[PDB]
């Protein structure tokens, strides 16, 4: 009742926690060919860099889900998602939170990259228009916003509007269109994404 949810049953907050919790146990397996991949991209993080990397495109891969919206949708089978995507709205914020926390363009960039694309099945189109299309029922956050994103990554988006979401992703699907790397992005992305799930 009244809580930011990730599904009927279950909190964002605590199917957060859940998710980390299973991170801890596993990350030993996974963190040094992600340091690696992040590495084939010139990007130098240590591992305990990565760790916190990982762990924050954990707390914030639905993030999005905190939309008014998508938060209607799993509470009221009447009202119906119309295309909306949460991952856009995801990767928005995951974006502007790495980005203070490694002040690396690129490293923020991969990051919202795999967020917005943690849907696609692994081993993975991105127009301006498409972005509309999935961001048109975007009515904004929970009133809880900032309150949310405190208990989970422990500040404020306060320190760092629809529009604004749609101006970064489409900016975002083209500079991603665009690359040679295709084959590459698609192990690096295909690299971050497997711990996800
Ligand atoms: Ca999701
Ligand atoms: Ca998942």
Redesign the pocket.
């Known amino acids: 009742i009244m809580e930011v949810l990730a599904f009927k049953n279950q909190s964002l907050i605590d199917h957060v926690n859940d998710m980390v919790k299973y991170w801890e146990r596993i990350k030993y397996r996974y963190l040094k060919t992600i340091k690696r991949a992040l590495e084939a991209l010139n990007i130098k993080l240590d591992i305990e860099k990565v760790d916190e990397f990982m762990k924050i495109l954990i707390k914030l ?2 993030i999005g889900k905190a939309s008014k919206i998508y938060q209607r949708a799993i509470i009221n089978d009447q009202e119906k998602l119309m295309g909306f995507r949460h991952e856009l709205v995801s990767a928005y914020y995951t974006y502007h939170i790495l980005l203070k926390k490694f002040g690396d363009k690129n490293l923020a960039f991969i990051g919202a990259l795999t967020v917005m694309l ?1 849907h696609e099945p692994i081993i993975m189109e991105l127009t301006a228009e498409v972005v509309l299309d999935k961001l048109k029922k975007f009515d904004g956050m929970i009133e809880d916003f900032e309150d949310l994103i405190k208990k989970l990554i422990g500040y404020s988006i306060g320190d760092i509007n629809k529009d604004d979401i749609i101006r970064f992703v489409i900016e975002m699907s083209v500079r991603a269109r665009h690359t040679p790397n295709s084959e590459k992005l698609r192990f690096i992305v295909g690299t971050l994404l497997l711990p ?2």
Do not use: G, K, S, Y
């Open positions: 891969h639905d943690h996800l799930v």
